[PDB]
Amino acid sequence: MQIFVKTLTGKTITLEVEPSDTIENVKAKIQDKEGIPPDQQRLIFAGKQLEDGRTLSDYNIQKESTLHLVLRLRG
Amino acid sequence: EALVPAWDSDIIFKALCYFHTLYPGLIPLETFPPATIFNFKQKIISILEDKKAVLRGEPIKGPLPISCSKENYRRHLQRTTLLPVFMWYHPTPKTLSDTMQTMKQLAIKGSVGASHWLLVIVDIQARRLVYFDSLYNYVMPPENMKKELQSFAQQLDQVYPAYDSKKFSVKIAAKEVIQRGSGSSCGAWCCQFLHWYLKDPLTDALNDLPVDSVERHENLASFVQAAEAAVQDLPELSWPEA
Ligand SMILES: [Cl-]
């Protein structure tokens, strides 16, 4: 199924996933599209952080749900 | 061990969350992404329009925060008296869209480079806009920024009228360079100034700093050590209750 991931610029990435995918596997799919290492990523859905070790289905994420990718910005 | 490291968007957000627990009128606006010099006025107008809608009992038009429930965000818009508008700046990009691309590129590299943190405080109760640049004139001369903000204050009097007719005023906080002794202490300076302002909205603390740069920097290091201890165990990516 397709899901969307929003980034800080407002641009949306499209991923192909299954509900049994781990959050670490999703972060690898984002790396393939954006070149960001998994260790630098945090993901949010429905107001909560998605934790490594869980699956998409553990959060009731469905077809065409939108996740948010958060990075650390220095200044 | 007097270190002041370059503060990122995450520690600045946690400091805001903590400052709300102490002063509930402060709304902990998210920093992922923060505003820029090219959209801070639009962001503030959008927030004030939503606060007016919550006061009338109407729906909000957003945009919504990502780490807050929609109902908690409505409760914070009802409560708030003070907007802490962090702005991220880089001297190379010259539009909003080019500044957002520069921000992503540096985020992914992990580099500070020539980027800087500025603060605009919107004091709703005092009707005051306060601009804090720790570097004094990093973006432009201060007399130029005062003129831009005076025109914006006139717009805010139409967008967000008081019961009486009081007009928004403008304060340029820094009368000369504040940040001496380090190239990377801007985010820490912004949070220290915001805490002084919360304690006293007429604060003159910027005009009472040590003269030598190594002592002034040591004092800010003490603030940084205390703030990091205070936020360490508070919830990651989660707004406090209004
Ligand atoms: Cl608030």
Strands B128-132, B169-172: parallel, antiparallel or unpaired by DSSP? Answer: parallel
DSSP conformation class of B67: S
Rounded Cα gap, residues A30 and B185, in angstroms: 32
Residue A70 corresponds to which amino acid?
V
| Degrees, nearest 5: CA angle B162-B158-B168 | 60
DSSP conformation class of B5: -
Rounded Cα gap, residues B242 and B238, in angstroms: 12
Tokens of B56: 């009338």
| Sign, Cα dihedral of B189, B193, B196, B198 | negative
Rounded Cα gap, residues B104 and B7, in angstroms: 17
Identified catalytic residue from B68, B186, B190, B191 = B186
Query: Residue B189 contacts by C-beta under 8 Å, 6 or more apart in sequence?
Result: B132, B134, B178, B179, B220
Q: Quick check: is B233 catalytic?
A: no
Rounded to the nearest 10°, the torsion over CA B60, B63, B65, B66 is: 120
**What is the whole-number distance in angstroms between the Cα of residue B215 and the centre of ligand 1?**
35
Count of the separate structural domains present in chain B: 1
Q: Give residue B19's region: left, alpha or beta (phi > 0; psi -120 to 50).
A: alpha
CB-count burial class (<10 Å; 0-12, 13-18, 19+) for A14 = exposed
Strands A66-70, B169-172: parallel, antiparallel or unpaired by DSSP? Answer: unpaired
Rounded Cα gap, residues B13 and B5, in angstroms: 16
Q: If we measure between CA atoms, which residue out of B114, B116, B108 comes closest to residue B92?
A: B114
Q: What is the number of other CB atoms lying within 10 angstroms of the CB of residue A60?
A: 10
CB-count burial class (<10 Å; 0-12, 13-18, 19+) for B100 = buried
Q: From the CA atom positions of chain A, what is the Rg in Å?
A: 11
Rounded Cα gap, residues A58 and A55, in angstroms: 5
DSSP A11-67: -EEEEE--TT-BHHHHHHHHHHHH---GGG-EEEETTEEPPTT-BGGGGT--TT-EE
Q: Which domain holds residue B43?
A: 1-242
Q: Which domain holds residue A16?
A: 1-75
DSSP B19-55: HHHHSTTB-----SSPB-TTTHHHHHHHHHHHHHHHH
Q: If we measure between CA atoms, which residue out of B85, B68, B86 comes closest to residue B76?
A: B68
Residue B235, CA distances (Å) to A75, B33, B163, B188 in order: 23, 19, 38, 20
- Chain B contacts of A8, Cβ < 8 Å? 32-33, 100, 103-104, 107
Q: If we measure between CA atoms, which residue out of A47, A72, A43 comes closest to residue A56?
A: A43
Identified catalytic residue from B76, B133, B191, B217 = B133
Buried b (16+ CB within 10 A) or exposed e, A19-42: eebebeebbebbeeebebeeeebb
Residue B63 corresponds to which amino acid?
P
Pick the residue from chain A with its C-alpha nearest to B187: A75
Q: If we measure between CA atoms, which residue out of A52, A53, A70, A69 comes closest to residue A13?
A: A69
Q: If we measure between CA atoms, which residue out of B37, B43, B129 comes closest to residue B82?
A: B129
- Chain A contacts of B108, Cβ < 8 Å? 34-36, 40, 71
Count of the separate structural domains present in chain A: 1
Q: Quick check: is B186 catalytic?
A: yes
Element (H, E) at B161: none
Residue B20 corresponds to which amino acid?
H
Contact (Cβ atoms closer than 8 angstroms) between residue B53 and residue B60: yes
Residue A33 corresponds to which amino acid?
K
Rounded Cα gap, residues B110 and B8, in angstroms: 10
- Chain A contacts of B101, Cβ < 8 Å? 9
Q: If we measure between CA atoms, which residue out of B120, B125, B127 comes closest to residue B169?
A: B127
CB-count burial class (<10 Å; 0-12, 13-18, 19+) for B1 = exposed
